[PDB]
Design a protein around this ligand. Structure first.
Ligand SMILES: Cc1oc(-c2ccccc2)nc1CCOc1ccc(C[C@H](Nc2ccccc2C(=O)c2ccccc2)C(=O)O)cc1
Ligand SMILES: CC1=C(/C=C/C(C)=C\C=C\C(C)=C\C(=O)O)C(C)(C)CCC1
Lengths: 232, 10, 272, 16
């Protein structure tokens, strides 16, 4: 509509939740599988959300109009940050823990026991608590994720500048949305964009881990997550 | 990227 | 805050910035472009030229720590290390000039510097670079990008990421007055691991952001979304830092006599 | 952690 309608971005978010129902498969009744390791329950959810991320992306204005190979490049480059941002925001509802898309609730101490604390603590403090304190809504989460998606620095793009232009269209829609919805706080726009640095370093640190939970194997992971892990 | 490429083209 | 307060902050940061950093972007570009009469930089494009650039200091006053004795990579490795250590000291002083900073819990001051220093070194390193190389030794020398890319094993790909970043960062055409604020905004980041009192830091950063926002609107009236494009670089910086850390780790594993200056060891110990 | 020198740099600064 207006290059980057904030409404469609919100619709992309809502379209691929959770949001009732999806929060019972393995949290209060049953639960296929039976893995004994928080890192496993997390890798499964991630693998599952990878499929939904593809659908989410197609709903972001102009993503699908990009050349198919560019679409592939963008999603391979941003999937970890895109997924971390989702579960982190979703986790605003819980205290000291994370809510997986599989409806599974991973507590702090389990992560600490599994040996992935610290990284888990960074997610909680640098992302979840930050998202909670400023109470970023789903429209905002959506735009930030769209900004992450449209990364012009992804190696291989057929037209980096086009991607940068799309990312810039999101900056404009978000800023406009913020001034109209949050005129009481002139610096919300900046506060939002400043949630990206932490997302990047945590995303990088998370990738470093995955590349360690692979080069040792022992009861492998799921296809796709594994496909995404074949390095950019 | 079988899965990703396949999921994207439908 | 009223525009006058924001304009005062911006001028205050600019002045302390000129006092903390000897080679400003304005001067650097002037040298890089060829428009300041006062000897021009010695160009180092290969091993022989690097020697006639350092041995040129032999005739000077023996100050450059370490000299030859071990390959051409260690020479560059010590030059960057030395400059880096100096930079941390200059950045530290500039940080103390940011209103509210020395009033923060000492521990948080140390943490903000710990995590902010390299991000700032790379932001400023860009001021001294163009597509073909980078200025070194207060601008007395100019080391070519190609040459650096031609170093051995992992030494050869340390700078390349920094030039790619520099090229994209320099395209924003920021000047020293814009940079003085941006740097202060990087320092006052309330998302650093281990911070004890987050609110004070975020409150100050909010004033700095408003000041940077007004500065860019006034200094760059035709450039659209510049504020947004600039803040985005803060996330780019996290990646240049971690990637550089991972590269320093390769050196550590692949060479027994790593030997990194204590201050840099202090900063990298338990970083990100 | 300690961060001895960073502390010193904040405390006093650096010589000539
Ligand atoms: C590119 C260059 O060269 C000279 C120079 C060469 C010879 C003599 C004199 C100067 N000045 C500059 C510009 C400054 O360019 C800079 C580049 C990086 C840094 C960060 C700093 N690096 C190091 C800290 C300790 C040891 C090595 C490094 C490294 O970055 C490194 C570089 C190449 C190969 C291996 C390691 C850190 O804290 O991580 C600071 C300044
Ligand atoms: C968090 C986390 C990790 C990785 C997560 C990644 C790459 C994506 C997660 C997506 C989720 C959890 C999506 C959802 O459920 O919606 C690793 C294993 C490195 C270590 C422990 C903490």
């Amino acid at each position: 509509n207006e290059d980057m309608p904030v409404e469609r971005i919100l619709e992309a978010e809502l379209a691929v939740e959770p949001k009732t129902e999806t929060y019972v498969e393995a949290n209060m009744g049953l639960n296929p599988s039976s893995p004994n390791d928080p890192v496993t329950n997390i890798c499964q959810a991630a693998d599952k959300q990878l499929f939904t991320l593809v659908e989410w992306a197609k709903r972001i204005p102009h993503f699908s109009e990009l050349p198919l190979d560019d679409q592939v490049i963008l999603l391979r480059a941003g999937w970890n940050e895109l997924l971390i941002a989702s579960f982190s925001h979703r986790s605003i509802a819980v205290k000291d823990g994370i809510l997986l898309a599989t409806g599974l609730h991973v507590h702090r101490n389990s992560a600490h026991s599994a040996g992935v604390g610290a990284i888990f603590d960074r997610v909680l403090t640098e992302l979840v608590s930050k998202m909670r304190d400023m109470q970023m809504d789903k429209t905002e989460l959506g735009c930030l994720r769209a900004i992450v998606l449209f990364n012009p620095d992804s190696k291989g793009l057929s037209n980096p500048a086009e991607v940068e232009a799309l990312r810039e269209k999101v900056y404009a829609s978000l800023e406009a949305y913020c001034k109209h919805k949050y005129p009481e706080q002139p610096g919300r726009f900046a506060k939002l964009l400043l949630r990206l640095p932490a997302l990047r370093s945590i995303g990088l640190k998370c990738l470093e881990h995955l590349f360690f939970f692979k080069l040792i194997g022992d009861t492998p992971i799921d296809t796709f997550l594994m496909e995404m892990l074949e390095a950019p | 990227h079988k899965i990703l490429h396949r999921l994207l083209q439908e | 805050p009223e525009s006058a307060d924001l304009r005062a902050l911006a001028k205050h940061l600019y002045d302390s910035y000129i006092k903390s950093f000897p080679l400003t972007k304005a001067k650097a570009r002037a040298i890089l472009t060829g428009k300041t009469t006062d000897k021009s930089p010695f160009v180092i494009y290969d091993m022989n030229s690097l020697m006639m650039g350092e041995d040129k200091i032999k005739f000077k006053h023996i100050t450059p720590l370490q000299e030859q004795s071990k390959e051409v990579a260690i020479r560059i490795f010590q030059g960057c290390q030395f400059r880096s250590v100096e930079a941390v000291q200059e950045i530290t002083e500039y940080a103390k000039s940011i209103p509210g900073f020395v009033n923060l819990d000492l521990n948080d001051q140390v943490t903000l510097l710990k995590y902010g220093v390299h991000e700032i070194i790379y932001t400023m390193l860009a001021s001294l670079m163009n597509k073909d190389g980078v200025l070194i030794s207060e601008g007395q020398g100019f080391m070519t990008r190609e040459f650096l890319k031609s170093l051995r094993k992992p030494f050869g790909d340390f700078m390349e990421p920094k030039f790619e970043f520099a090229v994209k960062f320099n395209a924003l055409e920021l000047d020293d007055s814009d940079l003085a604020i941006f740097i202060a905004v990087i320092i006052l980041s309330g998302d650093r691991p281990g911070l004890l009192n987050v609110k004070p830091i975020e409150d100050i950063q909010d004033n700095l952001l408003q000041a940077l926002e007004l500065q860019l609107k006034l200094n760059h009236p035709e450039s659209s979304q510049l504020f947004a494009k600039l803040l985005q670089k803060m996330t780019d910086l996290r990646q240049i830092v971690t990637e550089h850390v991972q590269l320093l780790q390769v050196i550590k594993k692949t060479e027994t006599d790593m030997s990194l200056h204590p201050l840099l060891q202090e900063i990298y110990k338990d970083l990100y």
